[PDB]
């Protein structure tokens, strides 16, 4: 029951910058027999299993690049990355093995990049979904930066709040962008009452929303 506390929660930094994140333990991790601090750092990239980077506080695992460094002793420790590359995108966790094992809560490493406008696409209900009396209208808002964004749905000039589920990817390693999905679901009845469907997207890359639309009558 040793407690581990990590900070900050997250950070965002450009390809090439240097960074440092910290880990504090509720008691000393220093072993009197070996004179080693039993503290280790893991990297978990999105979708993947954690990988060991550093152990004994500052010894680099085989095959690991030396831009990764860890430091500290006792109850305080740190991990440093010198020239963050785009593939460092990941959540970093410390882990004590002095007595049993305990992970920290993790620090998330976001990659900073040039602002980018979402590519927005809209898709009317498929005829096979209509066949079973369901109607889902789907908006993709792809490859934008930064991450924060607001989606509004309009039906025949009137906003719709409800029936809408949004989902967000994790940052892409390959280009450092975010994407988002926004699904409006209705009954097939409700769908055929109205005409024009519109998702409007508010991103700091414009004061005007990005709008894409379809009219049922044109399908």
């Amino acid at each position: 029951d040793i407690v581990m506390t990590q900070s900050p929660s997250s950070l965002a930094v450009s390809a090439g910058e240097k960074v440092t994140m910290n880990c504090k333990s509720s008691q000393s991790l220093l072993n009197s027999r070996t004179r080693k601090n039993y503290l280790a750092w893991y990297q978990q990239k999105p979708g993947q299993s954690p990988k060991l980077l550093i152990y004994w506080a500052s010894t680099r695992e085989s095959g690991v690049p030396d831009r990764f460094t860890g430091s500290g002793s006792g109850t305080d420790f740190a991990l440093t990355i010198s020239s963050v590359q785009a593939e460092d995108l990941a959540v970093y966790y410390c882990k004590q093995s002095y007595n049993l094992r305990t992970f920290g809560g993790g620090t998330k490493l976001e990659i900073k990049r040039a602002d980018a406008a979402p590519t927005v696409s809209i898709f009317p209900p498929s005829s096979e979904q209509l066949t079973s009396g369901g109607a889902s209208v789907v908006c993709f808002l792809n490859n934008f930066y930064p991450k924060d964004i607001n989606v509004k749905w309009k039906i025949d000039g009137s906003e719709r709040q409800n029936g809408v589920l949004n989902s967000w990817t994790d940052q892409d390693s390959k280009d450092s962008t975010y994407s988002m999905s926004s699904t409006l679901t209705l009954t097939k009845d409700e769908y055929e009452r109205h005409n024009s469907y519109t998702c409007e997207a508010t991103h700091k890359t414009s004061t005007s929303p990005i709008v894409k639309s379809f009219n049922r009558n044109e399908c």
């Binding site: 095959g63 094992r101 590519t119 696409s121 990817t169």
Partner: protein, 213 residues
């Protein structure tokens, strides 16, 4: 190659039990300590327990959160590790990883791919798969399934770049997710594009061609 493959997870009723197996090869199994760690969707890693190597008589330790309820053992002839999990609750819903810890030779710690455990009284249900027709962006709607995971590829995987697949979102015991893919407008609709959906839990494989207009 050192391999570790977890199995024995999936969907399980509250109060039920599971035994996770981790099948190992490529290293002298008996010389290493082995650990189990879990991670609920979106949350931090959590150490569950280890078992020590042959030199230490294969003794065990557990975190405070599972001690008394889960047990680890190993089949040292077959090079396999186990996690027995009793009286499961919604808190146990997570990915479970097998890890090789340490002990012995020249060169790495290694982790399996993990297995998803979902503790729920909702029942297995297959997805409905819908094509999303209009550089051009197509997609696939994967709707109405339980439990996670599903896997979505484009053209049996041959389209890999320009693919986004969004995390599923649970509502009324059914997940929905979508996948988009972006091609050159010059290639579709001349060459076809097909979304392939696999939902192992219901033994579902579906293909769905993206047909224009």
């Amino acid at each position: 190659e050192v391999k570790l493959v977890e199995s024995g997870g999936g969907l399980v009723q509250p109060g039920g039990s599971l035994r996770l197996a981790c099948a190992t090869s490529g290293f002298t199994f008996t010389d290493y300590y082995m650990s189990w760690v879990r991670q609920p969707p979106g949350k931090a890693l959590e150490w569950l327990g280890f078992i020590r190597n042959k030199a230490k008589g294969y003794t065990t330790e557990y975190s405070a959160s599972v001690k008394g309820r889960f047990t680890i053992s190993r089949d040292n002839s077959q090079s396999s590790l186990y996690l027995q999990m009793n009286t499961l609750r919604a808190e146990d819903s997570a990915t479970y990883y097998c890890a090789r810890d340490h002990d012995g030779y020249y060169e790495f710690a290694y982790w399996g791919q993990g297995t998803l455990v979902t503790v729920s009284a909702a029942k297995t249900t297959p997805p409905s798969v819908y094509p999303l027709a209009p550089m051009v962006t197509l997609g696939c709607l994967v709707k109405g399934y339980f439990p996670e995971p599903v896997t979505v590829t484009w053209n049996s995987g041959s389209l890999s770049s320009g693919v986004h697949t969004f995390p599923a979102v649970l509502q009324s015991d059914l997940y929905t997710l979508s996948s988009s893919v972006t091609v050159p407008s010059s290639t579709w609709p001349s060459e076809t594009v097909t979304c392939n959906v696999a939902h192992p839990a219901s033994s579902t494989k579906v293909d769905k061609k993206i047909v224009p207009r």
